[PDB]
């Protein structure tokens, strides 16, 4: 098997990057009916890691010219 798709549970065992969104006041991932995270490995030595996120990212709106 060249592409080993992984379950979403033991991904915590594998190191993942510390990527966090700086300009985010609140973010989360939906956990039902199962966790909405996936990982895949390739024997060449490659890791793919995909999530689902809904970020309420801030945006400094300059409303001087409103509307």
């Amino acid at each position: 098997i060249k592409v080993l798709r992984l379950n979403s549970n033991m991904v915590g065992k594998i190191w993942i990057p510390d990527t966090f969104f700086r300009n985010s006041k609140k973010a989360d991932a939906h956990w039902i009916t199962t966790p909405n995270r996936m990982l895949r490995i390739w024997n060449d030595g490659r890791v793919l890691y995909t999530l689902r996120l809904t970020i309420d990212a801030e945006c400094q709106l300059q409303l001087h010219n409103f509307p």
């Binding site: 989360d28 939906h30 039902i32 009916t33 199962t34 909405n36 689902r52 809904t54």
Partner: peptide
């Protein structure tokens, strides 16, 4: 083991 089913449109959900 159970399927990985999820709802695409949901902003927030719970059980």
């Amino acid at each position: 083991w159970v399927p990985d089913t999820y709802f695409l449109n949901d902003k927030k959900s719970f059980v």
